[PDB]
Structures are given as structure tokens and as C-alpha cells.
Amino acid sequence: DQICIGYHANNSTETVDTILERNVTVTHAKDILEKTHNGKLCKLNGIPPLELGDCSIAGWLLGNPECDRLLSVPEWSYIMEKENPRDGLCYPGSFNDYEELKHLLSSVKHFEKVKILPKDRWTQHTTTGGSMACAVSGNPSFFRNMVWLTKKGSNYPVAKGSYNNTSGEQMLIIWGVHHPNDETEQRTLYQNVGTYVSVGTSTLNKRSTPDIATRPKVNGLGSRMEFSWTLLDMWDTINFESTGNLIAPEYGFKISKRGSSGIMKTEGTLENCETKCQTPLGAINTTLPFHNVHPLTIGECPKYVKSEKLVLATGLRNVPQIIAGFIEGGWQGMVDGWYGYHHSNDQGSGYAADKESTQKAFDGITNKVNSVIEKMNTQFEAVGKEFSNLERRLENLNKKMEDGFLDVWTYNAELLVLMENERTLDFHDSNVKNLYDKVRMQLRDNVKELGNGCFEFYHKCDDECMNSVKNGTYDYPKYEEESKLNRN
Amino acid sequence: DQICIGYHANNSTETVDTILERNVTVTHAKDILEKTHNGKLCKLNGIPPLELGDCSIAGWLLGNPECDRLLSVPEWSYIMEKENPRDGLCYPGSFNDYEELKHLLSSVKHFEKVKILPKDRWTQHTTTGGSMACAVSGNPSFFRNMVWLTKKGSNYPVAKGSYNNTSGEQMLIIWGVHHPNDETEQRTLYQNVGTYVSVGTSTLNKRSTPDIATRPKVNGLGSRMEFSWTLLDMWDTINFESTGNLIAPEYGFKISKRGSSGIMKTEGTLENCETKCQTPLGAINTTLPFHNVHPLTIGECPKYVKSEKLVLATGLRNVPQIAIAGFIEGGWQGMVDGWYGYHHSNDQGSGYAADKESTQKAFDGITNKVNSVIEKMNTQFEAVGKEFSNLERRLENLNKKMEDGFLDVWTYNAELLVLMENERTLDFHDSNVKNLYDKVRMQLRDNVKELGNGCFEFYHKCDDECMNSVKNGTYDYPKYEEESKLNRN
Amino acid sequence: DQICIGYHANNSTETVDTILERNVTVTHAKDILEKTHNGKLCKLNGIPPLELGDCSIAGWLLGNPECDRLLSVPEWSYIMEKENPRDGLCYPGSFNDYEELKHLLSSVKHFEKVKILPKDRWTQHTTTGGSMACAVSGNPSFFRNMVWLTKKGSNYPVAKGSYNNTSGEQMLIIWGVHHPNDETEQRTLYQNVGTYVSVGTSTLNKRSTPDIATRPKVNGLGSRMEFSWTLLDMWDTINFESTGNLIAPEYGFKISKRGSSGIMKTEGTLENCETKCQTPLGAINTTLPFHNVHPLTIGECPKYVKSEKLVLATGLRNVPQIAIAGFIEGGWQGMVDGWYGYHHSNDQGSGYAADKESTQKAFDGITNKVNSVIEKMNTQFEAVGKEFSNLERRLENLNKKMEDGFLDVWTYNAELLVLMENERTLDFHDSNVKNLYDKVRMQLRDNVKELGNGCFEFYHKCDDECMNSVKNGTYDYPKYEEESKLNRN
Numbered sequence A: 001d002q003i004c005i006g007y008h009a010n011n012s013t014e015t016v017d018t019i020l021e022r023n024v025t026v027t028h029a030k031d032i033l034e035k036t037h038n039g040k041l042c043k044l045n046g047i048p049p050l051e052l053g054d055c056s057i058a059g060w061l062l063g064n065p066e067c068d069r070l071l072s073v074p075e076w077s078y079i080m081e082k083e084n085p086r087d088g089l090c091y092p093g094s095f096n097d098y099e100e101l102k103h104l105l106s107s108v109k110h111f112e113k114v115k116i117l118p119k120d121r122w123t124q125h126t127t128t129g130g131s132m133a134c135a136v137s138g139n140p141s142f143f144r145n146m147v148w149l150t151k152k153g154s155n156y157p158v159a160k161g162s163y164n165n166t167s168g169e170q171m172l173i174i175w176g177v178h179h180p181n182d183e184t185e186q187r188t189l190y191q192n193v194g195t196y197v198s199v200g201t202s203t204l205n206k207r208s209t210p211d212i213a214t215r216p217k218v219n220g221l222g223s224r225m226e227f228s229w230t231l232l233d234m235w236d237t238i239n240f241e242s243t244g245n246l247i248a249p250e251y252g253f254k255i256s257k258r259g260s261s262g263i264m265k266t267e268g269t270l271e272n273c274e275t276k277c278q279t280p281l282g283a284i285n286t287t288l289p290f291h292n293v294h295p296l297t298i299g300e301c302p303k304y305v306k307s308e309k310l311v312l313a314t315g316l317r318n319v320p321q322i323i324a325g326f327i328e329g330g331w332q333g334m335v336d337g338w339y340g341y342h343h344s345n346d347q348g349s350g351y352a353a354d355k356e357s358t359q360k361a362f363d364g365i366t367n368k369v370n371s372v373i374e375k376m377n378t379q380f381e382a383v384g385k386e387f388s389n390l391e392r393r394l395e396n397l398n399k400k401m402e403d404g405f406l407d408v409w410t411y412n413a414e415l416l417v418l419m420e421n422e423r424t425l426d427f428h429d430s431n432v433k434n435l436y437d438k439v440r441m442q443l444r445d446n447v448k449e450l451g452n453g454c455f456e457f458y459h460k461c462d463d464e465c466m467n468s469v470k471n472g473t474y475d476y477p478k479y480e481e482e483s484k485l486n487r488n
Numbered sequence B, C: 001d002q003i004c005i006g007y008h009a010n011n012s013t014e015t016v017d018t019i020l021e022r023n024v025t026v027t028h029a030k031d032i033l034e035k036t037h038n039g040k041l042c043k044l045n046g047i048p049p050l051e052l053g054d055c056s057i058a059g060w061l062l063g064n065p066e067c068d069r070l071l072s073v074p075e076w077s078y079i080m081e082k083e084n085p086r087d088g089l090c091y092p093g094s095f096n097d098y099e100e101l102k103h104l105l106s107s108v109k110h111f112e113k114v115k116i117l118p119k120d121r122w123t124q125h126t127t128t129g130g131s132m133a134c135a136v137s138g139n140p141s142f143f144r145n146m147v148w149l150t151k152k153g154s155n156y157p158v159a160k161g162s163y164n165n166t167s168g169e170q171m172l173i174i175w176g177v178h179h180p181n182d183e184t185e186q187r188t189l190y191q192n193v194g195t196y197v198s199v200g201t202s203t204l205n206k207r208s209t210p211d212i213a214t215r216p217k218v219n220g221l222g223s224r225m226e227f228s229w230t231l232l233d234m235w236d237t238i239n240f241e242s243t244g245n246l247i248a249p250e251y252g253f254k255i256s257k258r259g260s261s262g263i264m265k266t267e268g269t270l271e272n273c274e275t276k277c278q279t280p281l282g283a284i285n286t287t288l289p290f291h292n293v294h295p296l297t298i299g300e301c302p303k304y305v306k307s308e309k310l311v312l313a314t315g316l317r318n319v320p321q322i323a324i325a326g327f328i329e330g331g332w333q334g335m336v337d338g339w340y341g342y343h344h345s346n347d348q349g350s351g352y353a354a355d356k357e358s359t360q361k362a363f364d365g366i367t368n369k370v371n372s373v374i375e376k377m378n379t380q381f382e383a384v385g386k387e388f389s390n391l392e393r394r395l396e397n398l399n400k401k402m403e404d405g406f407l408d409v410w411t412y413n414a415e416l417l418v419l420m421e422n423e424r425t426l427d428f429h430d431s432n433v434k435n436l437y438d439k440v441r442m443q444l445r446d447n448v449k450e451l452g453n454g455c456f457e458f459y460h461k462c463d464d465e466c467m468n469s470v471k472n473g474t475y476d477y478p479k480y481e482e483e484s485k486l487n488r489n
């Protein structure tokens, strides 16, 4: 006496947003944005980071006496540094092309220290200088990877030193030039006035001269030390020549292995954990195409946006009924699929569920979500560059570029989710109506529409007849004759 | 008796573009692109800008004698500068890190001039030097904020000077080095050869040597003056030492205010008006989310898109054509109460009507759609504008390409959104009308007859109350079922 | 009798991808991505390129003796250069601001070499110096466009020279400074010790001092030679002055065309063709909006995308299976005259036809959609290739990041747009067919019988004329109202 069409309802209270209506309660949803992190600084793919502590890159490479534990550092995954490290250049001065050196370090995973110029080779100079700026146990000291050359007796012969790169791969060499305060300092230390420092390779030619002038006292001294670096290629030679004011290197840094790394500015300490994507705030264990944790991440991190909510609609609208049809609303007791029928024949009732339509819809929505998710191209992220106080325009350019790309991706994500939600919520209603129309057109003129969602039979359509009606194979003539009799 | 389903039509002539069709006429439309301006330069939030006139930034800061009106400048919101200022470096020369100085000036908004090295302190030199390039009333003169040190008698003692920044904020200081033409000028001015100019701070250490060489004559002189600048931090000392060829500063520029500003490149003047957004052509008084007036802007402004028409569709399609039939032909021109409605023609009389629920639902949907489109855009206090020297062409190309790419991306996004939501809205209205027709048909069942034009022909006698119930959902099939079979037979 | 409604099917095997399903076969498809080139380097707009061979830009401009084929070069469309040229600076040294010079050369289409300082005006210096690094047939030689100045007798007077730019356009001038190895070399070549080189223009002021030190041997020499360049404006003068170590110029390079070009890093030669776009792999001849050949192109051509397939679905879904059934069972292979149509079987035969109005409307809509996704692209003569030095790694990373980001954005846009448009068109065709069926049903009404498959059995007798009457849309309902009532019962 009754076969009806209706859809599925449940107790879900998930809300998605479309472009024509907000706060739409749905049965099934899927968040595609992650907002959680572990909160600890961990190991990236099992490799511990380089914990500099309160030391700077310059202090580590030059051998600041306070950074004595960073003398034989092993493999590392990324560098952990403080915003304002305390122990950098103990002797006041500058470091030429510091940011370029940091950028180079952003792609190096190991260093091996090679003794290129031994300290005892300077048989005609004094190699025991020091200062109270870099002092250990009260007594003066100096950088542990550099040599300060001073006159022996009352003479400063021309100092010449050379090295040929027979180590195996590229080498990093740092030297410095000392600028005294007054003329008496220069005469006491180097015995000559008008000195020069010459450094030359196959691709480098630099000659520097000292500057003597009264300067404001930094760390109790009016003198400065300017440091420079170069990258010595394989099978190349470097030459040193100076009549005074030379801080000769004693060790060279050889690149052992290369890879993808970065410098992360955190004030934390490493803890025992293993991670893949590491933000300055904590680790991430995710699979979604979006997150809103931190922009400057290191690793394989999906995507950063300023959207606080991105939920895709995977199911139908939750419209409880207050046997009716799909005009009134969904059904609570039809837990077998998505779309289905209901019947009340002589034998017994029961909430069935159509299989082909539900399967087709499930495949379509699954393909939709997979297409949205699996079109992101996530690569290694190591963004974050350092700029000097005389490169503000470049810093502004970088900031604007990142901001613009972020805004574009945010707009794309929000547009995609809204339009997709609207299309899916229309798709489900279209499928329900298609099923009802197919059933009605196959049944033809042996039934009576009731205007609420379903029919009333003009004949005794038994259980096999009923399954045939749902099967799609309903014989019209073989029950036609009786229907005409009752309808009239 | 009869009843029909139809929609609204009027005498609008607006046009929207869809992806499937061009030049579609609609009843209602919304414009979300601003293309007009007042053609004036006004004050931003009540604070007038700085009008340099024919003076450059270097001429203002160095104290050009022809820029004397700028010796004491109040607070500003932005700076107006001509493309090729005439009154600049009166004495020929250069200015190291000029573009960086301008970029710093882009976020300053106020300065205070503080006398750090008074001119009378140089008791062992001469401080009354002037050139005919920077001449006032015929006699020679010089920059008003700088001091030219020259030998006193027949001797040039070592010149020393210092300043401790006890003012409370960062200070900007400019010095200079003089490059003569020949050796006799060097001997006449400084009495010795092989000189130096040394400047040192806590983070700066610079030494310079003058260059003596014959040069092409600019402004009648072959000599040049090179200027440099620095930013002195709080509680920090600057030291000056020179054996000759030093143009010492007399004043320092303290940063009083700080904020978002910029440098406009215009040849116009200031006019008595107010605004919240600015372009080099004129101000913009708008609330729409997009504009296409000028890329260069100062303040919170609608996003720039290379577009000429961005119109959303709010109402329905326009088919003026209309016994009165239904929606098969077109809309009704007399149903001014809403968007969807009916038409009842019982024996008592006739009259159009509008259904409230569908109209309210469609109105809410359209309104929130336009809200979603408009409100998903972030506008900040962008301060577009940057200068590059003649040795940084690659940087200028990079900046131009970045800006052009981002603008193009945003234009494409906005255009595609508008073009797709228009078609979605039209399909929405068609579907809503069809849904109303189908609901009425299903509630009416076989009590009526369809004539194939959106209308129904009632079989019984439907009075005014009967039709009122029909357009209400309170229509009872059994109450008229018994007589209904008689008419069909 | 009977009249059935269905769509058209053929034997196509083209596939498109939607956002709800994959592996979807369609009747007609359009490819908008070009994946093939010509494989050869050819002329652009009839103008042959400039083939540097094994020479570099520095070697060509300076006058390297190996690059003697380029002492007179005609107008060019673009420059082809190798990744690691062999014949560059024969004398070891360096070239200041090389990348800026290449960037400037990326916008110049012709040069006119002009003799600005002849070699015979140096009447007090020797001008016949050479080296074994730049050797022609064993004997030492030197750069063809530069002059090496050496002491005459035992004296090196002050070298002085000047040129006034009266040519008619901007000029390029290159000069060099020589750094010896030991003091003996300096005394042998220039007599005096402690020399200088000064070059000055209206906007340039430089003073270089030679550096004497022992350096690793490159090309058998420990000495080096440093080169600098400048751009001299019209009606301007350049002054040279030196006491030693001056590599004076003899020719200037006047810019004479000033168009749009570039430098292509290729390792191939030139053939005899004529193209419009030129990628390093080969030439492109197409009229499509996309290609995936190479990121760097020269000329005008489609936009680059990192993808493998972009197919637009124009036709209908291809289901083969079809008394005759209708669109519900599937399409037909018989009526190849349109997309949607009717099928009738009356007493005087049977056949197929097509509804012209619906097919025309769908065709225009699809063409508008295709042209709207194609014509919204912004195409321009853009420059991509840029060069950076070993101390400019951050800038190179910035440029690479910007290019990769824009490429990813546009690729994603193209893919998602294609998917969405395919879904819309495949639903649009079904909506059109269903609308046709519903229109015929509403018009035809009670005189007929629906049958499920998608068609209608008449309750009266009909012939061809009635079939056209149904097909055109004018079907007289009352003319069979009495007749259809009799056959109903």
C-alpha cells in the first residue's frame, strides 16, 4: 500500500559553509586544516639539531672561548639560534658578508676542521697575543681558530703563508684585519706604520689597509677587528701577505656533506622526539593540505593560511522529520547507506536503502575530496632570510612577496571550499529527485501520488513485486489489467 | 477559475556577463568596482602632507638656499616630490645610499632638528666658506645645515668633534667630503695634501680620501662633494676626525613620530579637502571593495584590479513578455511586490500577488552571496613605492615583475568569481520558480488541469478564501474531491 | 506511432577528467596544450640572431683575438651564448658589474662601434704591448678594442684623454686597470711606483690604485687585469688620467636600435627557418593558449604550465546503446546532423532528425565558454632569464622562488578551471535533453502516453505533417481533443 523515497539523517552537529548559506548542519564532514602542534623542538628524520645555545654563528666559526663545546660538532639537521646571541665577537668588530655566510650554511649539514696553517710555522713572529675582552680564568685569551701575529723582538718581517686545497671538497676560510686605536698601539704591536694585508686566490684579489682613529669604547676597547671569508675551490691556492695587522687563520672548514637545512630562531632546548615538519613553536604530525601554525616552517609542511576553518561537506543536510517522503525531511532509522526506500506492505515494513545511487555518490564525493587534496605540490620549505641594516628594500621585497603568495593561496582555499560545499549539497538533492523520478516513471499509471514524497498502490504488489520495483525490473502489463479496474 | 506562476520584470537596462552568455539584461545588479576620483590631492585623516615643491629630499635635508621654506616642517602624512626636482645638490656631487634614505623616510612622519655640533666651536678653523653655485642675492653661500672647514691663516689643525645621543630617539646625521679640481685649490683651501676624513660610531668605521682630478664642468665647477649618512642609536657617540676636506654637520634630525607614510611623485599642488585613500591622480571616497584608478596608493584602499566592469547580478533575468499566462513566455511587469508570485482570476475578481517565503529566502541568499564575495578580501595600509639607482636595474625589474604578477592574479580571481556567481544566480532563480510551480502542482494533484504555460485550470469553484488557502499550503484535497470527479466525467 | 527523444553518439575515444569522476569518454574534445616544438634554432621575425660561438659577452666587447669574426656585427633578434664559454678574458682578471652589463645588453638590438680615442694620439707612450695569454700564431698580442700604455724610453708622463659624446645616442665605454705581480714588473712597465687611474664624467668619479702581490698562476700569469664600464650620455664628456697601469679604450659602443631581446643559454647552432617564438629546445608554431616545453622563451608564444594533459570537453558523454529507445537508455549512432534530436516512426516510414534550436544554443554556449577560458590570458613580451654572481645567492634564490610560485599558481588555476568546466558542460548537455523532453511533454499533454524509455505513444493517428507540427512546437491540442478521448477508453 506504500513505497516511499527519502534520505538519511543522524545525530551529527557538524557545520559547513557554502556561498548562499552559512552554518549548515551536515551529517558527514571533513576538516582539511590543522591547528595543533606538539610544542617541543625535536629531531628531524632522526638527526639531532645543532644547538648553538647562547652563541652566534661567528662565535662558533671563530672559536669564542665561551663556545668551547662547539669545537667538534657532528652531523646536524637544522641550526637552532637565539634572536640576540650573547657570545659572538668578544673583540669588537664586524663581519663582512655575514648574511651570505648564513645563507651558505642554510644548505650545509656537516663541517670537518682541517689544520691548514699550523701556529708553530710562524717562526719569525709572536703568536701568543690576547685580550681581556676574550678572557678565561681572568687571564687574557683569544679566538681558538685564529692566530694573532705580533712583532718578535723589535722587528716584523713580511709574513707569507699559502695553502693548496687537497682535502677533497670546498673549504671555508676566515681571516681578519686589526684596526688599532692610536699610533702608539700600532708602533707597540707591529713596529711599522702604513701596513697592508693581501689575500689572493684564482678568483679573489683583496688588499686592505688599517684604520687608526679614536672610537667609542665597545667592551672596554677602542679598537676593532674586521673579518672576511671566502670559499676556496678544489685544487686551488690561497696566499697571505702582510706587513702588519693580520689575524691569520689556523683551521679551515671543509664541507663534508650537503643537503636541505635552515636556521630557526628559537629560545628553546631540544627534547627526545622524532618529527618531520618542525615549526618554531613545535612539531607537526599531519596529512591535511592546510595549516595555520607558523609561516617559517622547516621540512615538508603542507601550506600556511589565515583561514581559521576549512571543512568540506562529505554528506547530506541534517533535516530531522518533525511514512513521509523526502519533501518532509530525512529519516533517522535508515542506517544502511545514503538514499533508499521505505515500505509498509502486508507482510512487513522496513527501512531499506538503495545501493547503486549511494555507491555512485560516495565515489563522486570521494573523488572530489581527493582531487582537492592531491593537487597541492608540497616541497621542502626552508624560507627565512637574514638582511643587514643597509638592505631594508630587499627585506621589504621579500616580506611583500611572501604576504602576496599567502593571500592568494588563502583566497583560493576559501573559494574552493565554499563552491564545492554548495555543489555537493545540490548534488545530493538532485540524486534524490532523480531516484524518485525514475521510480515514478517506471511505475507509470498503476500508482497514486500522495504529494508528500511517495505513492499508494492500486494493486496488491507483494514482497517479490516490491523487490522488483526496487530492482528496476517491474513488469507493467503483467499487473496492468487489475490496476485499471480499481482506478476506475 | 485559474492560477499561474510567474516572476518579476521591470524597465531596468543593466547588463551582466556570464561565462555562458554575454550581455545579459537583469532587473537588479550591484557594481563593486570604483573608477572615479576627485582629481585632487588632499589631507589624510586631517593631517596635511609635506609639499617639497621644486626641492628634492637631499636639498631639504642638506639645507639648499632655495629650500628655505622647509627649515622647520610640521608633522605630515606623506611627501609630495616632483619627478625631476630642480633645486637639489647645488654643489655638484653624489649622495651615497640615497634610495635607502628615501625608504627610511617612507616611515618617519616627523623630524626634529637638534644642534649637535655648533658652528662656533671650530675655534681653530674657518667656517665662512661659500660657493657661487649655491649663491643668494649674488654673493656666494652654502648649505644651511652644513659647515665648510677651511684653513685659518696658514694652518689647518686636526679637527675633532663628538656628540652623545642624549635626545631620546634615533638620530640621522649627514657629513660630506670635498673633492677638489687641482692641487693648487687643495693647497689654498687646506694647506696640506694627503688628507683623510674619519667617522666612527659604535657600529660604523669609515675613512675617506679626497680625489683630485679634472672633471667635466657641472654648474661651472669641476669639483664634487660626496655625502654620506648614518642612523645613530640611543646613548651612542659619533666621532669626527679630519686633516682636511670635511663638510661637518651642524644639525641632526631626530625621529619624533613613526608610522606608515610614503613619497608621492606628482607635479600638482595641495588643495583644501580631506580623504582616507590617496592616488597620484586624486582621492577616492568609496566603500566598494575594488578600484582601478591608480596602482600607487597610500592608506587603506580597495584592491587594484586591471578591470573596467565588475558587476554582480542580484535580480532576475529580464523577459518583458507576459488570458494571462505564466513563466513559459516571460516575467510580469505588474507584480511589484517581490520576485516570485501568483495570479488568481476567480469570479469575484483578479489580482497579482507575491509569495513571502520564497522571496525572503532568495533575498537572503543573494545578500549573503554578495557579502561573501566582498568580505573575503584583506586591505591593509600598503605604502607602494620604491626607488632604485642606475646600477640596480635587476632589482627594479624584479620588483616590477612581482607587482605585475600579483595584480594580474588578483584580476583573474575577481573576474572569474563574478562571471561564475552570475550564472549561478540566474540558474538559482530559474530553479526556484520551477520549484514553486512543482510544489503547487503536487499539492493540487488531479483536481486541476494544466494548460502548458505555467497555469492551472481549477475544476471546482475556488473563491477568494479558497485561493488564499491555495497560496498558503492549507488546501484540503477531500473537501473538493467528491465534486471533482463529476466535472472530469 | 511513436516519437522518441535522444542524443548523438559516435566512435570517438577522447577522454576528459572531471571533479567527480575520471576516464570519461566524450564525443568531441579540444586540446589547449601544445607539447611539440621544431627542434632547431631559427630566425625571429626575419632577423637572424647573434651567434657568439665559444666567445662570451666580455670577450666580444673587449676584442678577444679569438672572437675576430664579431668585429662587425649586424642587427640581431637575440643572443645565443654557451653555458661555460672558453674564449673570454684571455688575460686573467675580472669584470666589475658583469651581470648589469648583460641585463643592459638584453634590451639592445644593435651597436655602432665608434673610434673615440685613436691609438696614434699617445705620442709619449708605447702602445704595442702584448701577452702570451692572448697569442696569435705564437707571437704575443692583445685585445683589439683596447690599448696597453707603456713607458717610452725611461719616462711615463701623465696620460690624459677626453671624448665628447656627439655621436647621437648613448655610448658604452670600457677601461681597465693592471695589477702586476712584483715590484720589478711595475718598474719595468711603468717606471714609477705608487700610480693611480682616474676616470670621471658628469655623474662618475672613480680612482683606482694598482695592487702588487704574488697570486696563483692562471693561464701562466700571476698578474690580473680589472675592467670597468660606464654609460655615457649624449653631449657629455669622459676624462681619463693616469700615471700608470691604464688599459685605455679605443672604441665606443653606441646604442642604435634599443628593442627587446635576450640571452639564450644554448649549446647549438642556427638553421635556416623563420619562427615567432623560440625556446632553447626548439621553435614553437601554434595557436593555442598553453605549452609545456620550457620555462624560458623568447618572442610571443603561449604561456608555460607544468602539467601533462589539459583537454576541454566540447561534445557529449559517449554511451553507445540506444523499437527504438530514448535518451534514458543512451545515445544514438544514426542521426549525425546535430547533438540532440527526435526520432519518429509513423505509418509512412521512419527516420531521425535534430532540434536545431537546442543544438545551436548549446553550441554557442560551449564556444563562448571555450573562448572565455582562452581569451582571458594576458600575453606579453616578458623577460625571464637573469644572471647573478657568486656573492648574490640570496637574490638568485628570491628570483627562483618568485618564478616557481607564479608557475605553481597558474598551473593549479588551469587544472582546476578545466575540471570545473568539464563537469559543468557534461551536466549542461543532460539538462538540455531533459528540458527538451519536458517541453514536448508539457505541450503534448493528455493525447499521448509516456512509456519510460523516453518517448510517447500517440492516442490518435498521426502522419508526417503532425510530426513536424510536434517538432516545430506548434501542435494543435483541440484538433485531436475529441479523437483522443475516444481511444483513451
Ligand SMILES: CC(=O)N[C@H]1[C@H](O[C@@H]2[C@@H](O)[C@H](O)O[C@H](CO)[C@@H]2O)O[C@H](CO)[C@@H](O[C@@H]2O[C@H](CO[C@]3(C(=O)O)C[C@H](O)[C@@H](NC(C)=O)[C@H]([C@H](O)[C@H](O)CO)O3)[C@H](O)[C@H](O)[C@H]2O)[C@@H]1O
Residues within 6 Å of the ligand: A129, A130, A131, A132, A133, A140, A150, A180, A181, A185, A188, A189, A220, A221, A222, A223
Ligand atoms: C702588553 C701590555 O699589557 N701592554 C700595555 C702597555 O704596556 C707597555 C709595554 O709593552 C711597553 O714596552 O712599554 C710601555 C711603557 O713605555 C707599556 O708598559 O701599556 C698600555 C697603556 O700604557 C696598555 O694599555 C691599555 O691596554 C688595554 C688592553 O690590553 C689588552 C686587552 O685587555 O685588550 C691586552 C694586551 O695587553 C694588549 N696587547 C696585546 C699584544 O695583546 C692588547 C692590545 O693593546 C689591544 O687590545 C689590541 O691592540 O689589549 C686597553 O686597551 C687600555 O685601554 C689601554 O690603556 C697595554 O696593555
Ligand SMILES: CC(=O)N[C@H]1[C@H](O[C@@H]2[C@@H](O)[C@H](O)O[C@H](CO)[C@@H]2O)O[C@H](CO)[C@@H](O[C@@H]2O[C@H](CO[C@]3(C(=O)O)C[C@H](O)[C@@H](NC(C)=O)[C@H]([C@H](O)[C@H](O)CO)O3)[C@H](O)[C@H](O)[C@H]2O)[C@@H]1O
Residues within 6 Å of the ligand: B129, B130, B131, B132, B133, B140, B150, B180, B181, B185, B188, B189, B220, B221, B222, B223
Ligand atoms: C676666495 C676666492 O675667490 N679665491 C679665488 C682665487 O683667488 C686667490 C686667493 O685665494 C689668493 O690668496 O690670491 C690669489 C691672487 O694672488 C687669488 O685671488 O683665484 C682663483 C683663480 O685663480 C679663483 O678660482 C676660480 O674659482 C671659481 C669658484 O669660485 C668659488 C665658488 O664660488 O665656488 C669662490 C669661493 O670663494 C671659493 N672658496 C671657498 C672656500 O668656497 C671656491 C673654491 O675655490 C672652489 O669651490 C674649490 O673647489 O670657489 C671657479 O672654480 C673657477 O674655475 C676658478 O678658476 C678663486 O675663487
Ligand SMILES: CC(=O)N[C@H]1[C@H](O[C@@H]2[C@@H](O)[C@H](O)O[C@H](CO)[C@@H]2O)O[C@H](CO)[C@@H](O[C@@H]2O[C@H](CO[C@]3(C(=O)O)C[C@H](O)[C@@H](NC(C)=O)[C@H]([C@H](O)[C@H](O)CO)O3)[C@H](O)[C@H](O)[C@H]2O)[C@@H]1O
Residues within 6 Å of the ligand: C128, C129, C130, C131, C132, C133, C140, C150, C180, C181, C185, C188, C189, C220, C221, C222, C223
Ligand atoms: C718584454 C720582455 O721580454 N720582458 C721579459 C723580461 O725582460 C727583461 C728586460 O726587461 C730587462 O731589461 O732585461 C732582461 C735581460 O737582461 C730581460 O730581457 O724578463 C722577464 C723575466 O726576467 C720576462 O718575464 C716573464 O714574463 C712572462 C710573460 O711575458 C709577458 C706575458 O706573456 O704576459 C709578455 C711581455 O714580456 C710583457 N708585456 C709587455 C712588456 O708589454 C708581459 C709582462 O710581464 C706583464 O706584466 C705580464 O704580467 O709578460 C711571465 O710573466 C713570466 O712569469 C716572467 O718570468 C719578461 O717577459
Ligand SMILES: *[C@@H]1O[C@H](CO)[C@@H](O)[C@H](O)[C@H]1NC(C)=O
Residues within 6 Å of the ligand: A022, A023
Ligand atoms: C554561525 O555560527 C557561529 C558560531 O559558530 C556564530 O558566531 C555566527 O554568528 C553564526 N552565523 C549567523 C549568521 O548567525
Ligand SMILES: *[C@@H]1O[C@H](CO)[C@@H](O)[C@H](O)[C@H]1NC(C)=O
Residues within 6 Å of the ligand: A164, A165, A166, A235, A236, A237, C216
Ligand atoms: C695543488 O695540488 C694539486 C694536487 O693534485 C696539484 O695538481 C696542483 O698543481 C697544486 N697547485 C699548485 C699551485 O701547485
Ligand SMILES: *[C@@H]1O[C@H](CO)[C@@H](O)[C@H](O)[C@H]1NC(C)=O
Residues within 6 Å of the ligand: A464, A467, A468, A471, A473
Ligand atoms: C534483482 O536483480 C539482481 C541482479 O543482480 C538479480 O540477481 C535478482 O534475482 C533480482 N531480483 C528480483 C526479485 O528480480
Ligand SMILES: *[C@@H]1O[C@H](CO)[C@@H](O)[C@H](O)[C@H]1NC(C)=O
Residues within 6 Å of the ligand: B022, B023
Ligand atoms: C556586448 O555589449 C558591448 C557594449 O555594451 C559590445 O561592445 C559587445 O560587442 C557586446 N557583445 C555581444 C556578444 O553582443
Ligand SMILES: *[C@@H]1O[C@H](CO)[C@@H](O)[C@H](O)[C@H]1NC(C)=O
Residues within 6 Å of the ligand: B164, B165, B166, B235, B236, B237
Ligand atoms: C652618553 O650619555 C649617556 C647618558 O647620559 C651615558 O650613560 C654615557 O656614558 C655617555 N657616553 C659616554 C661615552 O660617556
Ligand SMILES: *[C@@H]1O[C@H](CO)[C@@H](O)[C@H](O)[C@H]1NC(C)=O
Residues within 6 Å of the ligand: B468, B469, B472, B474
Ligand atoms: C495561512 O497559513 C498560516 C500559517 O501560519 C495560518 O496561520 C493561517 O490561518 C492560514 N490562512 C488560511 C486562510 O488558511
Ligand SMILES: *[C@@H]1O[C@H](CO)[C@@H](O)[C@H](O)[C@H]1NC(C)=O
Residues within 6 Å of the ligand: C022, C023
Ligand atoms: C584514466 O586513464 C588513464 C590512462 O589513459 C589511467 O592512467 C588513469 O589511472 C585512469 N584513471 C583512473 C581514475 O583510473
Ligand SMILES: *[C@@H]1O[C@H](CO)[C@@H](O)[C@H](O)[C@H]1NC(C)=O
Residues within 6 Å of the ligand: B216, C164, C165, C166, C235, C236, C237
Ligand atoms: C660637447 O659638444 C657639445 C655639442 O657639440 C657642446 O655643446 C658641449 O659644450 C661640448 N662639451 C664640452 C665640455 O665642451
